[PDB]
Design an enzyme around this catalytic site. Structure first.
Site, mmCIF file in Angstrom:
data_model
loop_
_atom_site.group_PDB
_atom_site.id
_atom_site.type_symbol
_atom_site.label_atom_id
_atom_site.label_comp_id
_atom_site.label_asym_id
_atom_site.label_seq_id
_atom_site.Cartn_x
_atom_site.Cartn_y
_atom_site.Cartn_z
ATOM 1 N N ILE A 38 0.817 -1.215 0.000
ATOM 2 C CA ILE A 38 0.000 0.000 0.000
ATOM 3 C C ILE A 38 0.848 1.261 0.000
ATOM 4 O O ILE A 38 0.333 2.352 -0.210
ATOM 5 C CB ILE A 38 -0.940 0.035 1.213
ATOM 6 C CG1 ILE A 38 -0.158 -0.196 2.503
ATOM 7 C CG2 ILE A 38 -2.006 -1.037 1.073
ATOM 8 C CD1 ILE A 38 -0.935 0.203 3.741
ATOM 9 N N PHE B 1 13.050 3.474 3.114
ATOM 10 C CA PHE B 1 13.531 2.398 3.980
ATOM 11 C C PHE B 1 12.606 1.191 3.923
ATOM 12 O O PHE B 1 13.062 0.036 3.976
ATOM 13 C CB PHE B 1 13.662 2.898 5.424
ATOM 14 C CG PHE B 1 14.448 4.178 5.545
ATOM 15 C CD1 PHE B 1 13.934 5.372 5.054
ATOM 16 C CD2 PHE B 1 15.707 4.187 6.128
ATOM 17 C CE1 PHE B 1 14.656 6.551 5.133
ATOM 18 C CE2 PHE B 1 16.443 5.361 6.222
ATOM 19 C CZ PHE B 1 15.917 6.544 5.723
ATOM 20 N N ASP C 250 11.036 15.554 11.001
ATOM 21 C CA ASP C 250 10.587 15.281 9.632
ATOM 22 C C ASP C 250 9.076 15.526 9.489
ATOM 23 O O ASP C 250 8.356 14.736 8.883
ATOM 24 C CB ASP C 250 10.953 13.843 9.231
ATOM 25 C CG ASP C 250 10.944 13.621 7.719
ATOM 26 O OD1 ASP C 250 11.079 14.600 6.953
ATOM 27 O OD2 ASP C 250 10.809 12.454 7.297
HETATM 28 N N1 ANP Z 1 0.119 2.984 9.123
HETATM 29 C C1 ANP Z 1 0.000 3.182 7.813
HETATM 30 N N2 ANP Z 1 -1.224 3.067 7.241
HETATM 31 C C2 ANP Z 1 -1.347 3.283 5.931
HETATM 32 N N3 ANP Z 1 -0.403 3.601 5.043
HETATM 33 C C3 ANP Z 1 0.797 3.702 5.632
HETATM 34 C C4 ANP Z 1 1.086 3.515 6.969
HETATM 35 N N4 ANP Z 1 2.432 3.715 7.218
HETATM 36 C C5 ANP Z 1 2.926 4.006 6.045
HETATM 37 N N5 ANP Z 1 2.002 4.011 5.028
HETATM 38 C C6 ANP Z 1 2.230 4.312 3.613
HETATM 39 O O1 ANP Z 1 3.555 3.933 3.274
HETATM 40 C C7 ANP Z 1 4.322 5.104 2.904
HETATM 41 C C8 ANP Z 1 5.756 4.960 3.368
HETATM 42 O O2 ANP Z 1 5.816 4.983 4.812
HETATM 43 P P1 ANP Z 1 7.093 5.520 5.575
HETATM 44 O O3 ANP Z 1 6.941 5.192 7.015
HETATM 45 O O4 ANP Z 1 7.288 7.009 5.271
HETATM 46 O O5 ANP Z 1 8.340 4.736 4.942
HETATM 47 P P2 ANP Z 1 9.835 4.919 5.429
HETATM 48 O O6 ANP Z 1 10.755 4.427 4.348
HETATM 49 O O7 ANP Z 1 10.074 4.024 6.684
HETATM 50 N N6 ANP Z 1 10.180 6.526 5.843
HETATM 51 P P3 ANP Z 1 10.496 7.617 4.565
HETATM 52 O O8 ANP Z 1 11.510 6.986 3.534
HETATM 53 O O9 ANP Z 1 11.073 8.879 5.130
HETATM 54 O O10 ANP Z 1 9.148 7.960 3.801
HETATM 55 C C9 ANP Z 1 3.541 6.264 3.503
HETATM 56 O O11 ANP Z 1 3.812 7.503 2.864
HETATM 57 C C10 ANP Z 1 2.102 5.797 3.284
HETATM 58 O O12 ANP Z 1 1.720 5.955 1.922
#
Ligand code: ANP
Length: 313
Positions: free
Chosen positions: A16, A21, A131
């Protein structure tokens, strides 16, 4: 494999979302039937960036709040880290803004107060997010905002939202919230450029266009939050009962948690105890260890389910 242990507890749905990361999958916690979102990270691919994950994980384990996306379960295998989170199906604040072009001042205030609630709470726990931006704010099923992405929590981030003193900790989050405010009300960034040097100069300069549809009150608030000198930048506390923020509101921002784990829900404990083949007393003792293992996750998901049901009862 790495997934076999996970599939003991969850059945995986579609990807989704993704990020720098994580790959994020919708999933269903089998025991309770509750949907969740699972962040999947590869340790080998992350490499030297791995501390960010353990950072996010330790932050989230000590944060619990209406506008913080809840962590239920942490699972490490040979090559992967899994973080099981509160599923927020409403998508990012980012996409919402684009959908509306810009928010009215009124709806901006509604959104901003929730952001402010979350960030003030986070500071109350000794952290700075670092952030903050519309991509890291998700809508849940009831159109309520949930802050995510806590890997930069300090006890840094997208440039357009980054404070001046930081590109050369509370004041910084205030700055970012200012940028966010601007974006909600305007539909675009106050400081924007494809050229990073140019963008940098714009930020250090602190001059931005101020559109005709904006209220003097909000213009003022913005200029208080987007003070280039953090010494002159408004404080969190004064943001919390600022007149713009308090406009049409007899309530100051309730940043305090409405969801502390004061004490164990009897029904939830009971339900767990049956499946676990242990007395309720025993289960209580176990749950209180809060390991963010399968027990923790099952307990918290049962709790979330119950709350959802109680809201329609
Ligand atoms: N709890 C959640 N429910 C629904 N969608 C989610 C959720 N967590 C993350 N997502 C989706 O997944 C995407 C990526 O999540 P994210 O936590 O930013 O990834 P990350 O690699 O760990 N951090 P970053 O690289 O800075 O974006 C988000 O922008 C949402 O589209």
């Amino acid at each position: 494999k790495d997934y076999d242990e996970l599939l003991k507890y969850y059945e995986l749905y579609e990807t989704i979302g993704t990020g720098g990361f994580a790959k994020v999958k919708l999933a269903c916690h089998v025991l309770t039937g509750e949907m969740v979102a699972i962040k999947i990270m590869d340790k080998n691919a992350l490499g030297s960036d791995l501390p960010r994950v353990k950072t996010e994980i330790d932050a989230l384990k000590s944060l619990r709040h209406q506008h913080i996306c809840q962590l239920y379960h942490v699972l490490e295998t040979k090559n992967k880290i899994f973080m099981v989170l509160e599923y927020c199906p409403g998508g990012e604040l980012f996409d919402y803004i684009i959908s509306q072009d810009r928010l009215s001042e009124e709806e901006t205030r509604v959104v901003f107060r929730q952001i402010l609630s979350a960030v003030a709470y986070v500071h109350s726990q000794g952290y700075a997010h670092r952030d903050l931006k519309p991509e890291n704010l998700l809508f849940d099923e009831n159109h309520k905002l949930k802050l995510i992405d806590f890997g930069l929590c300090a006890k840094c981030g997208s440039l357009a939202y980054a404070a001046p003193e930081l590109i050369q900790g509370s004041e910084a989050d205030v700055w970012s919230m200012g940028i966010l405010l601007y974006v909600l009300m305007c539909g675009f960034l106050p400081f924007d450029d494809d050229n990073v040097m140019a963008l940098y100069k714009k930020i250090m300069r602190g001059k931005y266009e101020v559109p005709k549809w904006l209220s003097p009150s909000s213009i003022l608030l913005l200029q208080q939050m987007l003070q280039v000198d953090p010494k002159k930048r408004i404080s969190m506390r004064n943001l919390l009962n600022h007149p713009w923020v308090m406009q049409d509101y007899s309530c100051p921002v309730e940043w305090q948690s409405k969801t502390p784990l004061t004490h164990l829900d009897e029904d939830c404990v009971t339900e767990l105890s049956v499946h676990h083949r242990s007395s309720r007393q025993t289960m209580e003792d176990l749950i209180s260890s809060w390991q963010y293992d399968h027990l923790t996750a099952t307990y918290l998901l049962l709790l979330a389910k119950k709350a959802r049901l109680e809201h329609h009862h």
